[model samples]
Target: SMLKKKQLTVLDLHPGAGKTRRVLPEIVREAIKTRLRTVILAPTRVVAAEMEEALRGLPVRYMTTSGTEIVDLMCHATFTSRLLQPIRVPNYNLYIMDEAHFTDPSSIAARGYISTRVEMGEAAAIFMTATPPGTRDAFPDSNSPIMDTEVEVPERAWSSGFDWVTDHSGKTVWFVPSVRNGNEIAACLTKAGKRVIQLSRKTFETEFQKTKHQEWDFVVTTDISEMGANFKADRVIDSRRCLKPVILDGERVILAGPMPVTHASAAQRRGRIGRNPNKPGDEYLYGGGCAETDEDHAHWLEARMLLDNIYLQDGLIASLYRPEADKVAAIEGEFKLRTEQRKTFVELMKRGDLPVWLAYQVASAGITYTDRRWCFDGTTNNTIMEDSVPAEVWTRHGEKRVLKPRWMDARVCSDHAALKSFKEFAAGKR
Candidate 1:
């Protein structure tokens, strides 16, 4: 006369309640099943790129690119190297736009939508965040509902990972705060007959000449070592950049963080543990979360806003410099798409409905009266009604076969759309 508990506790009111236990797994599974080319955008490139790495084992391919080696490893996905680099646009089925609330309409990553269309606009963008874009208009379309939940840590299964803590009966656990503190703590540990490894910016740069650090039982480091730097430690006391040590082949990675932090940063710090390919989730922590500081808040806001204007600047700069680089005879192929219809043209570029490279040229006012993709090399009329479309799609031009929509024709013939706002679509727009 008894019943088994349900597999999932439906957080009817509070969606983010117990986020990791319920939502994360579901989101990961959905993303995998859909085989969507998802992008997990965060406040910082570091956080965004790290989250991409954390989702490695799912049934999907992932990749990321940034200055650090953490950005180098192409986990289950492909990396674009530099965020500003022109991506050739892979035909991905779905795109989970994580952290959608940090809406920067003008970010290089955000603007990627211009060149890459989302599966006929039916893209599934699952944005997880405590901060929701500060406005409703941030999303391209409003097909989502506000998910609410009461969050709490379950105490029942909490102590399982704490088994490692039992081994450190009387040995010291040092909280090395700064470079000075790091050196001091390391010396103390080494004096205690423990092998010590000091991983710092200096150590990494000259590691080839340094003595063997492999013998150290305890490691010392600045924030850089906390990143993917390799070492051995029964316990770790990460002072800053708590996200540095994942994928470092470490067993117990302990980190300290100032709580009241954003949800994204918290997730990243947690990811630093259990990076071994064999160990799915073997991270342990003896820490407390602190609310973010006013400084941290300001940093978050500024970084989020930076993406907005930077993207447009990138587009404008690209438009200005592309011609000089290409050395095309007529540097007049400017694209203007301020109107919805014009925006549609840019959207078409992504859908393979139109040529993005040509659209980009047109958007940048680079389209010369004598263009090649359109006109001949000598500025003559070079419109390729045939070459533009797929061979299978085209019949005789004069013939009434199903022809490719001449969206570019409108721009090629007209004076041009709004030059400034038009360029935004040159990157990405609705």
Candidate 2:
């Protein structure tokens, strides 16, 4: 705890190095002495639950699952809401963000809260993560990062991946990349006569507990088990098997293969099994094959994230200032994403690879799904619907415009009303 006097500290510690245990308590103590309100943002509910347990006697309140609480601790999802003002009292606050690697540079929820708090000039930010985001700095505006020395637990022992499944007989956690894979793997495991339960968000509380008690022979789960969850498993069979969406021939296609062990979530999975040095755990990496991550897919995901930030920033800038005319804190950032980003985003939008809801938020681009493929076009108007008359009787712009009952949806119209109308006119109108 010595030499701990920084406004910003990146606790880049080993997975089981008690990063949360040390930093959180120390910050809580500091907050107590300084009388500052501490905001604890966990990346997930499991982490929040662990934080709650770690700070049993500490002065803090947990936000109820019902999403109604002026509490100190909550998940990353709730940090962006403006209603959190009541908790920011007097403005001098402290933020302890666990699993801080989850923050993207273009995340408005993260940036809005972190920047707003830092700009106020009375808060300390602790970013705790074992897996630091390698692509970009999540907190580029922050101060010095502190790396830890305690990387206990020797390298985890491993077997020949899925081939060892025939003879293994201990509590095991099977890590799958997607929920579909989880279900498929669980089905295969059950057919082989192994007891299994794919983890579900609806029953994770009981399901996680069920694993600790050895109630499951194999727990097939997604990355949800990767971060901040303690599974008392003797071995982990990690499938490098993954399906990533990538742009192929201008369309989003699933590229099913193995990603690398380094960024393939190998570190966290390695961290999971070797936790108990006394008991001695092991791992198996099925599909241990490797392939380079694609660049366009990377940009596609990042551009989408930037669009979200832009969307929120637009509303935030509008509601906090401009017409709303209130004390909206003018944090420094562009409301618009970069032009190059918009180019790639629009390319994807044209291919129908973009999330359908984003069309409502972006005025520069629009999309309308056809029964065959999505039709899209960039425009200056608020929406493609802006120039159109009612579909009951079409005014003759050039040709007879007929509408389809299937295309007459508020959701579909909200996306690209003119495009939908145009597609039905060119394709068919019911």
Candidate 3:
């Protein structure tokens, strides 16, 4: 249907659904036979390289930029790299996004690039990914049981046994949470007489080549190795906690903290294995072997259960695109104000002072329309004042013009219960 119509087609499939091998190559070959120019956009450089490797042996020309020699296929650039260029090769008739679901709605630049192609009429677009938005899909239907036969490790090893895992045989890809952690794990594994490779942002080629040689016993990596990396391993292991630095209260702190492993991540790690169809692989949960009483294991289990059956949390995704129910009521209230308040609101809207969405948020907090004030507070301390000072004073101030806050500051509201209720209510809803 896609080829016949020469129109936009959205292909949704899971990872390891044979997209790179069968679906992508078929499209490229068809485009070549028809003599239509084609461009494939992968989300990352690693994925792009993999795509290039997958499309090898095909009868297609490769070109770097827009120029004299028009190529039959171009599959080298990343989403960011392609968009960053001053001029894009806009001659292609088919724009194939392999693993395209990587571009979420929050990906402004990526989505902008797609919108540019659509608006410019550059090519018929096809978005192909295994992890497509499960908006209209369900768990069992959207997600397939992983190829890797999962093995729950010992509870002690899971909690603090990064070193003990080196004792186990076969080529293992250990999924840590950070580069530092990867290095630390690699050091421990290497000291234990295992050939270990730390897979970081710069080690794509190194890791790929190492796999070809089959010398490494373990490959330690973060979530970076989760997507588009095609490597055969006997088993994959995920470390529940990745010790990394983070900013807390404006101070940089390095802590051994957990980042939630989502359903997609778990699936992606599992998909790494079973790439070689002849030999089925295994996935080891580093922290999944403990009981509910175990503190270290509780968080890991909580995350796993939260994402256990779902493909992607549809409710979470829905929250991104939709305004909160309270915010909806706020928007309704904003439109209902009469007289001077409505006049000021319209003026603020025109001046970009009053964002409709923000107003919706404020109204949802049960703050009255008359109570919503644009006031001047402490300039140096960045203090927010109530309607004590007028909007005109701040707008007309010398050095910089003050703008209204994005949302109402909760401190001033007399009815704290309403504010607290709205906060808790909004939290529980999402």
Candidate 4:
């Protein structure tokens, strides 16, 4: 009933709207009955694995990688990996993208896939996400109404997972932002006389297998915990300590903590609880130092804004640095800069010649280029001038400038901008 009439359908269902378990399987079953080929794309390996698991008992068949026994439904790849090796399926009439927000044009590697799909106007594309991009320009009909609903939580707490779930005589999956936090929380909860298991990306599956048959009061994990992992809890404890050290404007800074959960993350974490809408559940948030002074308040606001911009606002803040030639026309009117001047700004940003934070300001003050993604290197903690940039783009700046490190990761650049912004915000500058 919620399916759209158009070829490009975007479902903005609230978290836990049963998008995976109910809606997806139902559609998939119908497609199988019709004998149509189907492929479901997930944003991460965890989600893809979860999708594979969810479809286990269903009539629809699927796999995580291609070349598995050819069935009615098949391999689902992470968007990043999908780009590496194009889908091997002969043909498919449907394309369902989970966590569709990751396919927003500004998402690394997503721009090309989304752009081509819309341009070709072939396979039917369905985007499902709790948080869709702010703008709907990607679809043929931007005015299409969005489907929305709220998840039900009978008991919610912003405190401890152990106290709320364990103490309250319920089980919980506590999420922390870092490994150290997971260990600390696990230790604390265990010392407090609670049976707790901590999971990290490194050893979650093995740890899960070891404890699968055993009883535990709680499970603690970092963000890498499976997206569609089927572990229902009476409650979910969310640690607000998502802060990490980063470089911003040539200075080190930290962003988000205690109260740093963004609207999207909070929604997903909340989804961990109340796996069944009719069933009552709860959530708790812990730690994160208090925000008191003007500086502290500014840091808090900036962090939240950054999250909104990158996660929900079509990478608006990050886009400013990587403006396209056509979009530059809009920047001209908005910032009153000449075509050549604007081009120079775009060049510097793409080349990674400018400071990351400085670039964000320039783009935000005006309009950002939309055609290309910006370049920011995280491994080396440097700004990338360009990914496929020619040697000449640098030689003009000077012979030595051309000798800098070549940008290896295209998706990584966009991520760097967001990290750089947080790093600077943590340092207390706008």
Best by lDDT: 2
Taking the tens digit of each residue's C-alpha lDDT, what string does model 2 give over 1-430? 3212335566777666666777667767666656555677776677788788878887667774311122288776555432222232333256777776552222224534454445445456776777654522211211122111222111222233544564677777776755555766677777777888777433466667666665668888765665667777666666644444343443223343434433525556545665554554245344453344534332233323343433322244212111111212223333344444444344333344333223223423332232222232222231234346533333334444333331121223332433454445434342
Ranking according to TM-score, highest score first: 2, 3, 4, 1
After superposing candidate 2 on the true structure, give the runs of residues whose Cα lies further than 4 Å from its correct spot: 1-6, 65-71, 81-92, 103-122, 135-163, 200-206, 245-258, 261-264, 284-286, 289-430
Per-residue lDDT of candidate 4, residues 1-430 (tens digit): 2222226667776656677767887877665565554567665555555567778875544444421222233322233233323233244456676665441222323332433343445456676776544332211111122212232221222244433334556677777766655666677777777788777644655676534544777788765453445464656666533433333432233333334534445445545655555554244443332221222222222222222222211322222212111221122123223444344344334443333233344454443433122222123544344345522122222322221122232222233343343323222233
For model 2, the local distance difference test gives: 0.48
Q: What does candidate 1's lDDT look like per residue over 1-430, in tens digits?
A: 0001111111221222323234654655655454444443333334344455565554433343311112122311122222222343343333333333331222223423422333134233333433332222211111122111222322122333433333343222222333445666566555556655554433444541232344435445544332223232223333322221111121111122322333333333232333333433232342434232322122122122222222232353122111111212212222233344333334333332222333443434434222222222212232223335521121223222222222223222111122222223322232
lDDT of 3 by residue, 1-430 (tens): 3543445566766556677778888877776666666676665555665666766777544443331123333332333333323343355566677655442211222333443455445557777755443322212121223333335432222334444466567788777765555666677666777887777544565565566566778888766576577665767776543332222232111233545454445555555665554454354455431111112322222112111111211321111111111111112111333334433333332222232233333444454444423323323333332355422221212324332344433222212232233322222221
User: Worst lDDT window (10 residues) for model 1?
Assistant: 1-10
What C-alpha lDDT, on a 0 to 100 scale, does residue 301 get in candidate 3? 22
Of the two candidates 1 and 2, the one with more favorable TM-score, higher being better, is: 2
TM-score of each: 0.32, 0.59, 0.54, 0.52
TM-score of 2: 0.59
Please state the error at residue 280 of candidate 1 in Å: 19
Candidate 4 residue 42 Cα shift, in angstroms, is 3.8
Best model per TM-score: 2
